[PDB]
Amino acid sequence: IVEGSDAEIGMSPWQVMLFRKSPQELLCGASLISDRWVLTAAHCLLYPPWDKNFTENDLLVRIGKHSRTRYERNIEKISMLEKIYIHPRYNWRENLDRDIALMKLKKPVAFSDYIHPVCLPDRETAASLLQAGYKGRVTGWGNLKETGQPSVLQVVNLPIVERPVCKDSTRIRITDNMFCAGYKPDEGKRGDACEGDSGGPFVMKSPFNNRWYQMGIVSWGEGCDRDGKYGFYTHVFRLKKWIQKVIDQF
Amino acid sequence: EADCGLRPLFEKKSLEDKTERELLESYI
Amino acid sequence: DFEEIPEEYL
Ligand SMILES: *[C@@H]1O[C@H](CO)[C@@H](O)[C@H](O)[C@H]1NC(C)=O
Ligand SMILES: NC(=O)c1ccc(O)cc1
Ligand code: NA
Ligand code: NA
């Protein structure tokens, strides 16, 4: 996260770290949506242009964390993966359309003060809150600058951007399964996700019921925190029917 | 899922985090 | 860079 701040303890209890077993390293962010299911970006697991194709046994998820590098004894919980599910129309060949994946844990994780699931949006919450200017929150342990790494989880609040501005900021083809967020050059304030934050959550706190909803998944950006560029996020609600199909069948 | 999105150390105890008000103020 | 995690998880 660029131009963010340290999270408070328990501020993002749905935060998940995707961790490579060997070499032991941060791979991506992710989020806890139930005691057995974790949501992330498909490109965190499958990206053939970079020879990336992780299997369940390659990875662990670390839940309840605050420190990036420490083993947080008696606080974090480490879970093995039972199965990975990639969206069948995830477009890794072009523009990361439908950049979404689910991971089922081998055993349920115990909730605690530090471990708790986020809500997924309904149609009405999405329609009400996914408006230009409305702010969401992005969290992660990724790099602090494009060109270094945090001691603890970072948090930044960023406004959703009008779709024509998103489209006009890039040569990439933007789809309805993406939205973009970030400040404009003339707005003064700054902030973005960066490398290592992909797969983590963009959340909004509903003013109707005071619950946190995951509206986006950190998907892609051109650099980090560049003037005139924006971060792009998977539109969780648009893909929720797939999410529910996977959870219902498996 | 019944309790989703309600943080033990914040909403469950009626404590606010340091920047959630920024989000609320943007929901105009 | 990362602290070793317990062997049980590997
Ligand atoms: C990813 O790896 C799995 C397991 O080897 C394989 O079945 C699948 O076809 C691979 N996907 C791509 C896009 O190469
Ligand atoms: N490098 C990344 O994974 C990344 C993703 C989203 C951004 O907004 C910026 C960077
Ligand atoms: Na364009
Ligand atoms: Na920018």
Q: Flag if B8 and A10 touch (Cβ within 8 Å).
A: yes
Burial pattern B1-28, b for ≥16 Cβ within 10 A else e, equals: eeebbbbbbbbeeeeebebbeebeebbe
Q: Flag if B7 and A13 touch (Cβ within 8 Å).
A: yes
Q: Is the CB of A224 under 6 A from ligand 2?
A: yes
Q: Flag if A207 and B20 touch (Cβ within 8 Å).
A: no
Residue type, A53: N
Handedness of CA A238, A178, A168, A50 (dihedral sign): negative
Strand partners, A19: A26, A60
The top-level CATH class assigned to B1-28 is few secondary structures
Closest by CA position to A198, among listed A182, A183, A216: A216
Cis peptide before A23, with omega less than 30 degrees from 0? yes
Strand partners, A204: A213
Using CB atoms within 10 A of its CB, is residue A207 exposed (0-12), middle (13-18) or buried (19+)?
exposed
Output the CA angle A80-A25-C4, nearest 5 degrees. Answer: 75
Task: Write out the catalytic residue numbers of A.
Answer: 43, 99, 198
- How was this structure obtained? X-ray
In order, the DSSP letters of A90-134 are: -BTTTT-BT--EEEEESSPPPP-SS--PPBPPPHHHHHHH--TT-
Tokens of A125: 């919450």
Beta strands in chain A (DSSP E): 5-6, 15-20, 25-32, 37-40, 46-47, 52-53, 59-63, 77-86, 101-105, 135-140, 154-159, 178-181, 201-205, 212-220, 231-235
Domain that holds residue A96: 15-117+240-249
Output the CA angle A177-A171-A197, nearest 5 degrees. Answer: 55
Give the domain CATH number at A44. Answer: 2.40.10.10
Tokens of A181: 């967020």
Residue A70: its chain C contacts at CB < 8 A?
A: 3
Tokens of A138: 């992005």
How far apart CA A23 and CA A142 sit, in angstroms, is: 17
Residue A21: its chain C contacts at CB < 8 A?
A: 10
- Give Cβ neighbours of residue A180 (< 8 Å, ≥ 6 apart): A160, A161, A163, A165, A166, A169, A174, A230, A231, A232, A233
How far apart CA A111 and CA A114 sit, in angstroms, is: 7
What's chain C's Rg over C-alpha atoms?
7
Neighbours of chain A (3+ CB pairs under 8 A): B, C
